[PDB]
């Protein structure tokens, strides 16, 4: 699912509404990013039959 990662990160937030019970326990999304160690990253390339589709680098990636 998604064009990107099907990963979402959620942090449990408490907010009041006035439609239902007051003070509800809910999830507000908090930003998800990625990492990777240096050897591990070269490993990610090794399994793929590509490098990556995007990295927001030069002329070519940036448009994609």
């Amino acid at each position: 699912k998604d064009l990107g990662l099907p990963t979402e990160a959620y942090i449990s937030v408490e907010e009041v509404h006035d439609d239902g019970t007051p003070t509800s326990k809910t999830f507000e999304h908090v930003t998800s990013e990625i990492g990777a160690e240096e050897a591990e990253e070269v490993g990610v390339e090794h399994l793929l039959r590509d490098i990556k589709d995007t990295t927001v680098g030069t002329l070519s990636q940036r448009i994609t």
């Binding site: 408490e14 019970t21 007051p22 003070t23 509800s24 326990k25």
Partner: peptide, 9 residues
């Protein structure tokens, strides 16, 4: 304060 802590009514 005590009540509000429970999400219920």
């Amino acid at each position: 304060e005590m009540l509000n802590n429970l999400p219920g009514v």
